[PDB]
Amino acid sequence: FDTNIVTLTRFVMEQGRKARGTGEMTQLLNSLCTAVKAISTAVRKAGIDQVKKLDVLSNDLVINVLKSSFATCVLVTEEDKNAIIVEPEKRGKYVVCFDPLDGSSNIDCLVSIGTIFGIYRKNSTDEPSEKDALQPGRNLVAAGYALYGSATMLVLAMVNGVNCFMLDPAIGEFILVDRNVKIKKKGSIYSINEGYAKEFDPAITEYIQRKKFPPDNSAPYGARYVGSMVADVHRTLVYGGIFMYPANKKSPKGKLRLLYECNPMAYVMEKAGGLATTGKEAVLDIVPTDIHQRAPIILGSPEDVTELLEIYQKHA
Amino acid sequence: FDTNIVTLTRFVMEQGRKARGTGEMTQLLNSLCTAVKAISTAVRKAGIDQVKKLDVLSNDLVINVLKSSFATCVLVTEEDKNAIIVEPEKRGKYVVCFDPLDGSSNIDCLVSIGTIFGIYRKNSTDEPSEKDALQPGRNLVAAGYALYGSATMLVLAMVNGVNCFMLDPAIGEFILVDRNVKIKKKGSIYSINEGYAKEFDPAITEYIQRKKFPPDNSAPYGARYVGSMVADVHRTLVYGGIFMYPANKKSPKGKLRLLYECNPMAYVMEKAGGLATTGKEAVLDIVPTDIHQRAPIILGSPEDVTELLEIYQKHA
Amino acid sequence: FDTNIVTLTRFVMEQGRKARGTGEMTQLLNSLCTAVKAISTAVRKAGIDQVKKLDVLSNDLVINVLKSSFATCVLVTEEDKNAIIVEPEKRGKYVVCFDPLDGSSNIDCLVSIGTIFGIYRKNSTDEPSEKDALQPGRNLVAAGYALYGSATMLVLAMVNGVNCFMLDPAIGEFILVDRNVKIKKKGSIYSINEGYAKEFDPAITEYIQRKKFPPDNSAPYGARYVGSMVADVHRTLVYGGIFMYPANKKSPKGKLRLLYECNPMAYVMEKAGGLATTGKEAVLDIVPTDIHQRAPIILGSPEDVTELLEIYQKHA
Amino acid sequence: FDTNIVTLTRFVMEQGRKARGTGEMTQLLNSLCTAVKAISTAVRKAGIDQVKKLDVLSNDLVINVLKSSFATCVLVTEEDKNAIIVEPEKRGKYVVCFDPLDGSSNIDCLVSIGTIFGIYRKNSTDEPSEKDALQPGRNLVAAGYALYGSATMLVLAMVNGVNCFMLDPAIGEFILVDRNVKIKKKGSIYSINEGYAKEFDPAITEYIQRKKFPPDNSAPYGARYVGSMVADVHRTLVYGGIFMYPANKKSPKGKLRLLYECNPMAYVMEKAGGLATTGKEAVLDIVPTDIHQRAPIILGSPEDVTELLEIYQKHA
Ligand SMILES: O=P(O)(O)OC[C@H]1O[C@@](CO)(OP(=O)(O)O)[C@@H](O)[C@@H]1O
Ligand SMILES: O=P(O)(O)OC[C@H]1O[C@@](CO)(OP(=O)(O)O)[C@@H](O)[C@@H]1O
Ligand SMILES: O=P(O)(O)OC[C@H]1O[C@@](CO)(OP(=O)(O)O)[C@@H](O)[C@@H]1O
Ligand SMILES: O=P(O)(O)OC[C@H]1O[C@@](CO)(OP(=O)(O)O)[C@@H](O)[C@@H]1O
């Protein structure tokens, strides 16, 4: 009824045309979305090997959906011990790193989940088409996540910006809702698991104290922490605030994996105007060593992160 | 859960690859399906300018959906007085003739309806990209219909055969149900509006008498006539029988338009092994004069139509 | 997002509060709506050793829901031989006759099919309940059918007249689509299987002659037979016309059973100002000797059923 | 296609037949399920001058359905000032307290939100009914909430205990997912807004210290606050833990209202073996002076609420 019905493909296709493309991006994202519709539905009536299962089901629906587009060539998941090289007949120019169901086993309490993804391009003659083509996050060409909450959103970041598409469940199509979004300069909210982290935090500790009982003319920051990277980062895009998970134990700290949680998220944030830092290191410019390596991340509104860095500079 | 999930695009894409393609077919059919999901839904809760409206809504959703694929160039509908030439920036190599909602105003009685389509290719340098590129139905490269009944089916015929895909409404995807289908040689059923036609029929009259009270060792044909070309032809593909609408008044007889009802349907039938005849003329090889011209059609199981022709030969 | 939807459940309740007591009809119909829903989505996906199956599972379904509305005592199927008698702690005052999936034998062509149901009130006391309480004629409390077509339509024929509901596929409800339907006095369509009936047809033959060949300047009646009773009765309830089943070699010349098929439909047509005759008697007045008792049904717009019966007086 | 689904409606009825009379709860809850459904699909598409809106239309919706189950007499909203008194010919025995859309003010980030509802039985007679009949404490007949998250979960807290239902998005029903849930005796999570509460927090401050900083070798409690009450109470019902609202500068230090927010949740936690204290008294035992009476709620797994209260005895 919406008849200049901007679907994702519609969008992704007219951007390709401008790049003097070949199609693979569009075929790919098309393939990506069918895994996302089926995953959205798997979840929307979930609770109707054995224990783990859902993340797996999804993992295997994203690998098989991405192989069939003749667009991918190396694929990396939380779930697989090492990269999977797409067979020669179905290869294409793209490298996809993704987390098929972040939050996965913690959805009984109906918490908003997600699939997160980063897309690279193979630039090399051949190696053949190897895992070593796992390189710094500022080389990403597309990145984003699919959120599964009250409604299902595919937030997508590319060279030209960040766009928000929501699944219309009545036509099984992702339609452009929010367009070319930017993040608020600063904003009333901070997010960090304030338990344990408090006994183990760095200069975070002070920024937190500062955001609770402020010194200069203020009113305190509201705290919020869902416990799903996709739920706490998307809110941060939507309202403006800060998100951080550095937690010191594990020193390749974090818990969140660089290639597929941190670098899509950071790419989005930066493309919408936020900054994402390790505190000392800037996350999209860290160059990886392992496909499964772990990174500290802090992301959100520019001003607020600037704030934690200025604290961090005159500390250790 | 189905994970070698054969969607339409999946299918249409691996066939293109073999043809050493360019993409437009797939982009197109992709565009076609989004109009079909939205039309399926418009109908599935219909009854919840003014009087006519639905066929129109659909017409305008199929034109706008086909223009956005950079694949079409001339488009022809029941609804539009004359062809629409796709604007230069959005053009592609294909010509689509289609009936956006055959049956349209007769759906209050919840009768199964459909959108029917034929796809041509422009072979000419330029004319520019004109309506005259409306040529004989055996030149079609793709043809088929979307049925809207108990469930929603996109039956699609191409050079390699006829395939059946059903809409899974839980993932808004058309999935391959029935594959590479052929029609039964002969079969117990005939379809013709047996009212009026009886006071106005040709050698039909006798074939009908013959199918009611048979002479040689038989048992009578069951009659069935829904009154939607898509409903009565799809059953005919599915069970095997004969369908005919010649009705003599209008002598460019028929009522069904050649370019978009008769030639998709005939193409499907023939591609699945049936034959479709004007009785005297063979329908896909009739060459058109008008985009909106009318043709007599008889279609279905080979043997049964052969039967009406052999009657028709030794008559007028 | 439009705040006052007239669910079947509301409507039944507001007509029924204005009666009250243990007028269990509402939790009876409310449970009927849950299996009819359940069936509809099953049928809209059946496609995505068995000579019969989806229909025996519908059978199972209907029985279970009927029984758990502590509203029932004797149930009647096409499949189950014997009348099924509900057990003590789930008993309530009604007897319900139903055909769980008319046309399950034509799903393959996606025709149009439905659930027929006739409710009765257990009259004679503590029998406990076994078949006496089930064999009235014109004593139906409320009857009607579910049509699973383009959309799922539930027509309820009550004491007060006939209304139609639609399954709002989006909210999970049968919303009121027409409030007090009444048939066209004479229609323009005749529904009969003129194949293997034409030779075996009795008096009715003069009748079809006069419907095709018009004995004046009158314009001939249009043939229309979908071949699924839910489909032909409902179309005849909306565009008028005559529908008939006079089968001869199905010898109480009807294939159609009284308790489940014929009786619910004749109670709908009659509560909407239409006629249903056996051709000798009125179908509503026949007395049941056995549950699965076949019979003939001629039902339609009034002045047409009459036009046939005065032929039938003349005739035999 | 799996034949015996335990709809909320069946369950309520089978526990309730085993009570009987005018135990109207079933057409009351049955009508509650239709607006909760209706809301869910609205919220799953709100995205595809207004400082407030979807929630005033939910308000309108709930009121209308409540009233048409001829089951109600006094309704209580967050939006409407006064208790709304049902009119004579639609009156039935119950008083229902509800918050139509907790978190409507966070939809934009797709958090998780819900409908809270508390039912009461109009006690003192023919008042007619206006607010006396509405202000009990621990006298709730049944209460509970709708969580619109990944999926829509309806938790019903009854006399017999707590069970959870899921909206089967495909058949239009709340199917039984867990039959008699009881909380973990002590959880491992604490839910509180430590931002603009930390400085204003009273005794509760020692409590959060001892939940972060563990005074032994004990492992610290993990922070978790989604910031939408439906979301934090339900997660605390499944992984255990303490949830709290002690607001100080929201001065009966709680933002949360008793009749609609606090009371339904404390009746669920308690019927599932969990505690809800005001910190001085038990929240269930406070007496209502006005309908929109704010209050504090600490609710959780038993041995944790206790661990806080013995601090509170010590404290003040
Ligand atoms: O609850 P904790 O352990 O503090 O961590 C939350 C984070 O962990 C995540 C990923 O980092 O899940 P997970 O435990 O499954 O690995 C996300 O849900 C979220 O970003
Ligand atoms: O009912 P009649 O007039 O005999 O014709 C049925 C035929 O007409 C069709 C198209 O030929 O519809 P329509 O009247 O809208 O043009 C189809 O429904 C069907 O093939
Ligand atoms: O095709 P015939 O046998 O003449 O009768 C049609 C009737 O048969 C029905 C039941 O009455 O199905 P079925 O062949 O499966 O028994 C309906 O489809 C229809 O009303
Ligand atoms: O964020 P604060 O104001 O501290 O309180 C959170 C509570 O507020 C609620 C209602 O209690 O929403 P709201 O801000 O719209 O009033 C819930 O989301 C939640 O339980």
Coordinates of C-alpha atoms and ligand atoms in Angstrom, one line a residue, chain B residues 222-224, chain C residues 55 78 99 101-106 111-113 116 192-197 225-233 243-245 247 250 255-257 261, ligand 3:
Chain B
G222 CA -16.6 -35.1 -14.3
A223 CA -17.4 -31.5 -15.0
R224 CA -15.9 -28.6 -12.9
Chain C
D55 CA -8.3 -34.5 7.4
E78 CA -17.7 -38.1 8.7
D99 CA -17.5 -32.4 8.7
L101 CA -12.5 -31.0 6.0
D102 CA -14.9 -31.1 3.0
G103 CA -12.8 -31.2 -0.1
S104 CA -9.5 -32.6 1.6
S105 CA -9.6 -34.8 -1.5
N106 CA -9.0 -31.7 -3.8
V111 CA -9.7 -25.5 -4.9
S112 CA -11.3 -24.0 -1.7
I113 CA -12.5 -26.3 1.3
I116 CA -19.1 -27.8 8.1
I192 CA -24.5 -28.8 -10.8
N193 CA -22.0 -31.5 -12.0
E194 CA -23.3 -31.9 -15.5
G195 CA -20.9 -34.5 -16.3
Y196 CA -21.9 -37.7 -14.6
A197 CA -25.1 -36.6 -13.7
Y225 CA -19.3 -25.5 -10.2
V226 CA -16.2 -25.4 -8.1
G227 CA -16.8 -29.0 -6.9
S228 CA -16.3 -28.4 -3.1
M229 CA -19.6 -27.9 -1.3
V230 CA -18.3 -25.1 1.0
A231 CA -17.3 -23.2 -2.2
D232 CA -20.5 -23.7 -4.1
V233 CA -23.0 -23.0 -1.2
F243 CA -27.0 -25.4 -6.3
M244 CA -27.9 -29.0 -6.6
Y245 CA -27.1 -32.4 -5.8
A247 CA -27.0 -37.8 -8.0
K250 CA -25.5 -42.3 -5.6
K255 CA -23.6 -38.1 -2.0
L256 CA -24.2 -35.6 0.7
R257 CA -24.9 -36.6 4.2
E261 CA -23.2 -31.8 5.1
Ligands
LIG3 O1 -17.8 -34.5 -7.7 P1 -19.0 -35.2 -7.1 O2 -18.8 -36.6 -6.7 O3 -20.1 -35.2 -8.1 O4 -19.6 -34.4 -5.8 C1 -19.0 -33.2 -5.3 C2 -19.1 -33.1 -3.8 O5 -18.1 -34.1 -3.2 C3 -17.5 -33.5 -2.1 C4 -18.3 -33.7 -0.8 O6 -19.7 -33.4 -1.0 O7 -16.1 -34.0 -1.9 P2 -15.7 -35.6 -2.1 O8 -15.6 -36.0 -3.6 O9 -14.3 -35.7 -1.4 O10 -16.7 -36.5 -1.5 C5 -17.5 -32.0 -2.3 O11 -16.2 -31.6 -2.9 C6 -18.7 -31.7 -3.2 O12 -19.8 -31.1 -2.6

